[PDB]
Coordinates of C-alpha atoms in Angstrom, one line a residue:
Chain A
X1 CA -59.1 -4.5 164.3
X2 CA -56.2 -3.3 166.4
X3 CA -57.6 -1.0 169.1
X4 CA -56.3 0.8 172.5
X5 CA -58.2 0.4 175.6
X6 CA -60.4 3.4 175.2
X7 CA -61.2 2.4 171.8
X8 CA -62.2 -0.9 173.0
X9 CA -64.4 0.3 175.8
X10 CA -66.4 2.7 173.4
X11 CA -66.8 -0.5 171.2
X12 CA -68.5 -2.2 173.8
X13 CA -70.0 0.5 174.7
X14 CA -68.9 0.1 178.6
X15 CA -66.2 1.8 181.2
X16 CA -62.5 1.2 181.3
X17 CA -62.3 0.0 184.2
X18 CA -65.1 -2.5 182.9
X19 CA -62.3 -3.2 180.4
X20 CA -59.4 -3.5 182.8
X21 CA -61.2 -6.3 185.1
X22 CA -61.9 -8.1 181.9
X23 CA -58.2 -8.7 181.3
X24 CA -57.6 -9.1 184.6
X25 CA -59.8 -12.5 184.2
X26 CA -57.9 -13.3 180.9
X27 CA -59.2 -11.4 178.4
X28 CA -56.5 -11.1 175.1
X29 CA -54.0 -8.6 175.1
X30 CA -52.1 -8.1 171.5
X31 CA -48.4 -6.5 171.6
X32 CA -46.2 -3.3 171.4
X33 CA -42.7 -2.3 172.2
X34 CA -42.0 -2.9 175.8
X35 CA -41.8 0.6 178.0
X36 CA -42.9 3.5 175.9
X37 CA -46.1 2.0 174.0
X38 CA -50.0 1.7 174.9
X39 CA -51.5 -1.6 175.2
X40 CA -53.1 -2.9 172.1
X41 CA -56.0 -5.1 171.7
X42 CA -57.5 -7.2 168.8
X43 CA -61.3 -6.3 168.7
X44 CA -61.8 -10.0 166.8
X45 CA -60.3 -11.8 169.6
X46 CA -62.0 -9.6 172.9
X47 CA -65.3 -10.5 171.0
X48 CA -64.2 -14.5 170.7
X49 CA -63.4 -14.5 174.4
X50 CA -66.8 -12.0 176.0
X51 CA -68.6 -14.9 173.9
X52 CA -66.9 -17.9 175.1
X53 CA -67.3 -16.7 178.5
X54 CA -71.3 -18.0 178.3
X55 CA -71.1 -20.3 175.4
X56 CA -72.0 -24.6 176.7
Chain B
X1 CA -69.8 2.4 169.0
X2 CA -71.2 3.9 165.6
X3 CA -70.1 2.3 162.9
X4 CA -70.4 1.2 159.3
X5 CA -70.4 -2.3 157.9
X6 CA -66.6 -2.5 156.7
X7 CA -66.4 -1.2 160.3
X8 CA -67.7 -3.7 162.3
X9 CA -66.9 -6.2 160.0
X10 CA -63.0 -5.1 160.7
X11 CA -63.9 -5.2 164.5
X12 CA -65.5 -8.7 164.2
X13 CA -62.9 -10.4 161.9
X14 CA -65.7 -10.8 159.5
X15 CA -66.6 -10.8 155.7
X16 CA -69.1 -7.5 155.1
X17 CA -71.2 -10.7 153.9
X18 CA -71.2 -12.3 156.9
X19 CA -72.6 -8.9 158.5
X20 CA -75.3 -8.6 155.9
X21 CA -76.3 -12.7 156.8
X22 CA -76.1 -11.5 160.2
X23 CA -79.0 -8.6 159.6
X24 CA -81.2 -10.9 158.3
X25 CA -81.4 -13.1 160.6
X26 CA -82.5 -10.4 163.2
X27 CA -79.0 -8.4 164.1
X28 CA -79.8 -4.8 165.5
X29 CA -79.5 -1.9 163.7
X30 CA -79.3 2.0 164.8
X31 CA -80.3 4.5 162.7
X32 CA -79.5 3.0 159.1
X33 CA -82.5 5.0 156.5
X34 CA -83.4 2.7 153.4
X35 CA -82.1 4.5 150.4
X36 CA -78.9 7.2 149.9
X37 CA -78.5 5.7 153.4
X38 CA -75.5 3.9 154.4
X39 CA -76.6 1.6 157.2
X40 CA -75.2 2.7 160.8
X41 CA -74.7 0.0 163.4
X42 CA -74.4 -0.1 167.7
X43 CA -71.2 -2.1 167.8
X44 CA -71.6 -2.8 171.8
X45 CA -75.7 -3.8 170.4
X46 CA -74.1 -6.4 167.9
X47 CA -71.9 -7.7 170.3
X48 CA -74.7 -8.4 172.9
X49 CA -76.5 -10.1 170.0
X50 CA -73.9 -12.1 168.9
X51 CA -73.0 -13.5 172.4
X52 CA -76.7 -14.4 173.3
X53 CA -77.0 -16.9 170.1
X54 CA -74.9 -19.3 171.5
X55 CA -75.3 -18.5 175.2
X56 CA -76.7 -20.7 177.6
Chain C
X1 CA -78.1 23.1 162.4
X2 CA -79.7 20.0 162.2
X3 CA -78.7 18.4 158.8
X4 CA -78.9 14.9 157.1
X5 CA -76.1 13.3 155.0
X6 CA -76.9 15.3 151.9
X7 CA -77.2 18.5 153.4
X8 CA -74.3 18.1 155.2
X9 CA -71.8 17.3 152.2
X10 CA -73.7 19.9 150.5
X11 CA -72.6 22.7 153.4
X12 CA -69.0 21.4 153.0
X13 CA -69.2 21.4 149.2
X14 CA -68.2 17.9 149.3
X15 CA -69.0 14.5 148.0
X16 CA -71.2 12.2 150.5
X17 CA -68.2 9.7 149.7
X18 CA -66.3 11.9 151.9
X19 CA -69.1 12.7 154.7
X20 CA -68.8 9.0 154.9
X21 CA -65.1 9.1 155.3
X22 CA -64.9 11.6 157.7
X23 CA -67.5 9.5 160.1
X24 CA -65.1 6.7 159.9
X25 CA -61.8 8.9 161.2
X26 CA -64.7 9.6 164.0
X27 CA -66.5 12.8 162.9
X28 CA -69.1 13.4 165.6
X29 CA -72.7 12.3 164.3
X30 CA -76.4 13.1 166.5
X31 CA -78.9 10.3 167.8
X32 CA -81.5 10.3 164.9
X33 CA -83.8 7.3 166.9
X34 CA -83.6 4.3 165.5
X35 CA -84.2 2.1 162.1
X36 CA -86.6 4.3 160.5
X37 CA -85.1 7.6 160.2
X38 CA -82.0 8.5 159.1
X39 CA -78.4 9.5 160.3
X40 CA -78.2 13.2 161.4
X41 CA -75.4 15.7 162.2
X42 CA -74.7 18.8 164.1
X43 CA -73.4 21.2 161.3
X44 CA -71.5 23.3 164.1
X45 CA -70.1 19.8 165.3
X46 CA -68.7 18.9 162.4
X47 CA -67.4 22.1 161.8
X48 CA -65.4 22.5 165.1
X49 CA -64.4 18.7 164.3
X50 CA -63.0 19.5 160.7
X51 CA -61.1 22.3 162.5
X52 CA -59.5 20.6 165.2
X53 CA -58.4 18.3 162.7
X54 CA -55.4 20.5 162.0
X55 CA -55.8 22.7 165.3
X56 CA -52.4 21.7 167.2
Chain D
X1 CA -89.7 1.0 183.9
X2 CA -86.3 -0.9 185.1
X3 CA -84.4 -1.8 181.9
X4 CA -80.5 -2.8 181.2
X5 CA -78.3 -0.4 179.1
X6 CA -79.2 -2.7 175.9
X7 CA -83.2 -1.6 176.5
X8 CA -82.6 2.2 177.3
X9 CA -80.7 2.6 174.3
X10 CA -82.9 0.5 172.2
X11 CA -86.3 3.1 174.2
X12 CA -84.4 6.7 173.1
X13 CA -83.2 5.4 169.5
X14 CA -79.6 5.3 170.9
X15 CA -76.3 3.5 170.7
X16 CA -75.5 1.7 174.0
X17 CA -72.2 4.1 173.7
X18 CA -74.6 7.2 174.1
X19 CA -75.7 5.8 177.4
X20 CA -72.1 5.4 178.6
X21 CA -71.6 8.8 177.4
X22 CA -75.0 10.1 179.6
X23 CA -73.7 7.8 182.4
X24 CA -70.4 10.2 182.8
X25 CA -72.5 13.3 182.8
X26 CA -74.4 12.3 185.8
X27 CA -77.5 10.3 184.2
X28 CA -79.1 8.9 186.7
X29 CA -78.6 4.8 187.7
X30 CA -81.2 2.5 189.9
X31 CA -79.4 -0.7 190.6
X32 CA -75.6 -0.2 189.5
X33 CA -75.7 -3.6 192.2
X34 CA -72.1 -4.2 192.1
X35 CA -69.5 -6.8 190.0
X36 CA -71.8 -9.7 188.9
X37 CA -75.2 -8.4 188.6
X38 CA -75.2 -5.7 185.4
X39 CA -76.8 -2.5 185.3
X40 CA -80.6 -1.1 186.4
X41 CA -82.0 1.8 184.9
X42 CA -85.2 3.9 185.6
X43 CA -86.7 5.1 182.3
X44 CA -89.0 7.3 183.6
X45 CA -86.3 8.5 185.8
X46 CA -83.8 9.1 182.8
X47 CA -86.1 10.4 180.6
X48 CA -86.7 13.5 183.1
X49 CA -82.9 13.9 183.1
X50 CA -82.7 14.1 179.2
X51 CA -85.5 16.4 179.2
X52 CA -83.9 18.4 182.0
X53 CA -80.5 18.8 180.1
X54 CA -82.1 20.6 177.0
X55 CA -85.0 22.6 178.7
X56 CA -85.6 25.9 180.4
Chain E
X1 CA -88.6 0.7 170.7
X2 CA -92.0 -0.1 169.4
X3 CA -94.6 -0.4 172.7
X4 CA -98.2 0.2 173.1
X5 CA -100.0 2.4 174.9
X6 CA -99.7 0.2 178.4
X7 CA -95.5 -0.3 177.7
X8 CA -95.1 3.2 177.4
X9 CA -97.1 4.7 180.4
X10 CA -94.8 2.5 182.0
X11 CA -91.7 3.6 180.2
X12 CA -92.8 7.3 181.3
X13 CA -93.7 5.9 184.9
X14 CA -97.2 7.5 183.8
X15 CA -101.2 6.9 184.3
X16 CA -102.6 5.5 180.6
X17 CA -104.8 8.7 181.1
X18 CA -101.6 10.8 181.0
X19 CA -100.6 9.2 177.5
X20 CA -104.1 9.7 176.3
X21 CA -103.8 13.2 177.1
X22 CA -100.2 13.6 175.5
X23 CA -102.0 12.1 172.5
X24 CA -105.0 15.0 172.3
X25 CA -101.7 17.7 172.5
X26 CA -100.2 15.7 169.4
X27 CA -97.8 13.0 171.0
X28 CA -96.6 11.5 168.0
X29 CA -98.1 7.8 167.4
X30 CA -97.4 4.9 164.3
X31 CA -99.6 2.8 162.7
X32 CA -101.1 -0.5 162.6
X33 CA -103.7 -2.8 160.9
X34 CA -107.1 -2.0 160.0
X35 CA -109.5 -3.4 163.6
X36 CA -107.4 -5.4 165.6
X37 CA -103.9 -3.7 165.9
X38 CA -103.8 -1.7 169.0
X39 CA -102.2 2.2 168.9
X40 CA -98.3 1.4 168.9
X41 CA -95.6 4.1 169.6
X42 CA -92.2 5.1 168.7
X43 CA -90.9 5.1 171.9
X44 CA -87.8 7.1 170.9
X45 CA -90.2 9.6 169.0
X46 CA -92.2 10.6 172.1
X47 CA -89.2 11.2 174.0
X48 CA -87.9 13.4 171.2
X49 CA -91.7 15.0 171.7
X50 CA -91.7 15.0 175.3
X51 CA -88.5 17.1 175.4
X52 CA -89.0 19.1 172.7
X53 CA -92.0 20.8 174.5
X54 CA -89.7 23.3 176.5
X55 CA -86.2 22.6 174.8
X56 CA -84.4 25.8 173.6
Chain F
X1 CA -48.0 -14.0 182.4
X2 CA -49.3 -10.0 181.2
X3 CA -50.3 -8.5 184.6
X4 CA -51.5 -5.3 186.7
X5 CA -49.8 -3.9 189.5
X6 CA -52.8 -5.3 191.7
X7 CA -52.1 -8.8 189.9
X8 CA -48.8 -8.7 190.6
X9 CA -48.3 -7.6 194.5
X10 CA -50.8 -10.9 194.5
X11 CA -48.0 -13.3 193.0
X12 CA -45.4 -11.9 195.0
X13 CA -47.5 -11.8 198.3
X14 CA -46.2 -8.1 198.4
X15 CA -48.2 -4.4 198.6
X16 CA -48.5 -2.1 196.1
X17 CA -46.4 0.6 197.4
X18 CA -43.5 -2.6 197.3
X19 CA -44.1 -2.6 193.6
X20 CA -43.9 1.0 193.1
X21 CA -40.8 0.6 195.3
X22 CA -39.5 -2.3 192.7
X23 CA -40.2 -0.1 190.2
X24 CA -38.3 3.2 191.2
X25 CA -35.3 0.7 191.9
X26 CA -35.3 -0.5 187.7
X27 CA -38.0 -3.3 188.0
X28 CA -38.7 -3.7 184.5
X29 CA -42.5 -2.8 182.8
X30 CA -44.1 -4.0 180.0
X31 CA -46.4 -1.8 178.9
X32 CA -46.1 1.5 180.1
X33 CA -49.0 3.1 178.4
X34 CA -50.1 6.8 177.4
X35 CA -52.6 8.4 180.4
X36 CA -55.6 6.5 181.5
X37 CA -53.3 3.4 180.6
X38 CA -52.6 1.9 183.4
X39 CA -48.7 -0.3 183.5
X40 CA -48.9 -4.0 182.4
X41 CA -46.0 -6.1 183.9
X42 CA -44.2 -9.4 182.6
X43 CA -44.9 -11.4 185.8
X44 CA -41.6 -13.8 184.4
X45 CA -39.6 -11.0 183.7
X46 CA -40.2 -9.3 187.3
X47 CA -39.3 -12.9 189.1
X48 CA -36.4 -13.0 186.9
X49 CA -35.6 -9.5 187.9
X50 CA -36.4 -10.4 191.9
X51 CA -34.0 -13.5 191.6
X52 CA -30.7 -11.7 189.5
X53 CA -31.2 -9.0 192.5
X54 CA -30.0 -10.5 195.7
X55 CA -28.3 -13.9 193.7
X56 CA -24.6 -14.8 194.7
Chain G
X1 CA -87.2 -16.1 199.0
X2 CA -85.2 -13.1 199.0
X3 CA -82.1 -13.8 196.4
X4 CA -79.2 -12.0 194.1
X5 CA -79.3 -12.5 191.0
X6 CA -76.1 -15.4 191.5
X7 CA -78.7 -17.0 193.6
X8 CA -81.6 -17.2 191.3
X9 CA -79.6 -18.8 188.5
X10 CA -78.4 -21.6 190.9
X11 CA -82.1 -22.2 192.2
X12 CA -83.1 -22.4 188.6
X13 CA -79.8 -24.4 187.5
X14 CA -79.1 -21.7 185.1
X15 CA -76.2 -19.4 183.8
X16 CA -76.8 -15.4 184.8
X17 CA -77.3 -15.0 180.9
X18 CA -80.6 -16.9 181.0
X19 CA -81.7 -14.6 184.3
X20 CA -81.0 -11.3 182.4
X21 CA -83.0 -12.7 179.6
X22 CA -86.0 -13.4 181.7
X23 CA -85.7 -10.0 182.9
X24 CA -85.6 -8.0 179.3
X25 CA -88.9 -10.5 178.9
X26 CA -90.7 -8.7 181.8
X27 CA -89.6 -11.7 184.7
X28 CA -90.4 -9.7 188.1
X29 CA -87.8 -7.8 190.2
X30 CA -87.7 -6.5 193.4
X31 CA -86.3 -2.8 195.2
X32 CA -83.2 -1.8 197.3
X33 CA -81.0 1.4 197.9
X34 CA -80.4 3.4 194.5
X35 CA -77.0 2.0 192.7
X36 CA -74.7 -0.2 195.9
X37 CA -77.4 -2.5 196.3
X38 CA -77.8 -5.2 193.4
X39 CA -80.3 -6.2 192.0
X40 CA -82.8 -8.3 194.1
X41 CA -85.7 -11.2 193.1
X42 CA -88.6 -12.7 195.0
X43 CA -87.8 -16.9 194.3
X44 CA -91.7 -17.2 194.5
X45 CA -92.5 -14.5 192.9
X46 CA -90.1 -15.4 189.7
X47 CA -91.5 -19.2 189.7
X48 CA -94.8 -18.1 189.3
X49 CA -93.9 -15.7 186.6
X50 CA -91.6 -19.0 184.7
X51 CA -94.8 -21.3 185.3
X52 CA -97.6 -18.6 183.4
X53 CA -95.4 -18.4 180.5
X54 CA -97.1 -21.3 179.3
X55 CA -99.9 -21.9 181.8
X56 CA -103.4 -22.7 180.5
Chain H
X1 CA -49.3 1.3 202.5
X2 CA -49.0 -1.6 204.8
X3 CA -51.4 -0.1 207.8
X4 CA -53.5 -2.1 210.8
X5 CA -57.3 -1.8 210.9
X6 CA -57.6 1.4 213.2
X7 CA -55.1 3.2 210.3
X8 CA -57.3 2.1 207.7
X9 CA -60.4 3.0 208.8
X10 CA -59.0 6.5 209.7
X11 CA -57.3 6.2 205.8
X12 CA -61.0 5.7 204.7
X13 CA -62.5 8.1 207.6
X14 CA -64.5 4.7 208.8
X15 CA -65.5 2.6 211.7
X16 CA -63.2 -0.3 212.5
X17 CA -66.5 -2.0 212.2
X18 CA -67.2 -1.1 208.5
X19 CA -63.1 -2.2 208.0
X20 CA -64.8 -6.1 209.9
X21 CA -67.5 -5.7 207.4
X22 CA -66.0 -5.1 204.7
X23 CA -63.3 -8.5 205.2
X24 CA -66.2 -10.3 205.5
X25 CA -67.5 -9.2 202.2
X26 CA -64.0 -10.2 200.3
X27 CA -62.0 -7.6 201.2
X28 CA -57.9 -8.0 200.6
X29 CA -55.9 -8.8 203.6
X30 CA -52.0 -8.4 203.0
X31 CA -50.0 -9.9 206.3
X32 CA -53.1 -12.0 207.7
X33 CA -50.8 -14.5 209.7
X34 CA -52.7 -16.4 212.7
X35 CA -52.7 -15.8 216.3
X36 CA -50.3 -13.1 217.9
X37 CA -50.7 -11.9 214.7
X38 CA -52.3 -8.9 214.4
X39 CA -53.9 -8.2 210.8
X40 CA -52.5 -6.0 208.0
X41 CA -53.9 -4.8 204.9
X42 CA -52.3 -3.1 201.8
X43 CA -54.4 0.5 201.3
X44 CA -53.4 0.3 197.8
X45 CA -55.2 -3.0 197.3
X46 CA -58.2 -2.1 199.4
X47 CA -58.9 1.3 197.2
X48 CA -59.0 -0.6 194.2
X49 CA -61.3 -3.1 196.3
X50 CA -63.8 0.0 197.3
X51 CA -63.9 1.7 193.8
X52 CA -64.3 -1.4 191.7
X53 CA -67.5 -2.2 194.3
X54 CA -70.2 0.2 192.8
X55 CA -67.4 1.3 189.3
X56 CA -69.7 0.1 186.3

């Protein structure tokens, strides 16, 4: 589901600053509008990539 | 989070069946009753779960 | 008060239907303890929640 | 006994968001280490703080 | 979680003899197996206990 | 590439206060984000930006 | 020896997911400071502990 | 700001030493260059450094 970064951090159940670093080691990021719109995230895809991360 | 099963299925990209497959083979639940009980769910909990079953 | 599911809708005057829609749009629920007992609410919660729905 | 946020939830019947949440409100934390060693908690330690919170 | 008695004197930081003694002042306890089965506890329930015993 | 203002003063081998500086000046954003957002940049779109600034 | 938990994994040839495991299965830990210190292990003390899992 | 090591530390309210320390532990260097080259660092970027050290 399409979520914004605090509803992303209360669905892992972590800090959103846990969330920033995330993306800032290339965690997904969906879309918006460019200047004048939060940025979105796709709960499916987060999960895909915090289980990659430790997958063989 | 706290969720229901069309919930996290939304957040995982999943089918509610593949949630209810998921339970029994061992998934965490919170607080979920047995009977006029909708089942409630740890989001962040299923998410650690689901991670560490194909982690090394 | 302290009040399950039942009680709850039963307060409002309301289906359980909708108790269970309101805790999707994020109506506040308490930490009942686990698989074995059921979800509980905070009747005041709830109310201050169902009021700052339309509070602007 | 030192546990990670998954354990202390799963010990008070919690979601792992409700430890977040007691995290913010000054619940106490053993080994927060730093970034790439997760989270130590002291049960016995937050235990007294949750039964601090609601007392005399 | 579900512990016995040595899991949750540890949980609780405690002496065996102080769980023993919550016991006798009506710590809640679950059940078991007729001669074998060891006393197990709700952890989550004797929190609830333990805080309830000066909680306003 | 989708980057912070940390991520981005590291490409450009610049401070912080520089972007901010960039930014006052018309440097174009990506996401600007509602409070506790923090500003996403188009790392392409600032070189592109950098380039068109001081080009004959 | 005296070792972070980055440490550990690369004396056992492991990923930090196996380490945190070990630890929610009782694998002995060591003290520091109170949250700015991580989490520490005694290499002897943890190799003992991985051999008597399955010691006669 | 782009500051030397004595501004920093007094930016911080620190020993120089601690700013020594703290490079040695990872700590950002903006304008490093070699030798009649005095060291500058980006206060902006060493912040974010220091908070995201014990941040959960």
């Amino acid at each position: 589901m399409e979520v914004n970064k605090k509803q992303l951090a209360d669905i892992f159940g972590a800090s959103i600053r846990t969330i920033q670093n995330w993306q800032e080691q290339g965690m997904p990021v969906l879309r918006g509008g460019g200047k004048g719109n939060e940025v979105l995230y796709d709960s499916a895809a987060v999960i895909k990539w915090y289980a990659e991360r430790d997958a063989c």
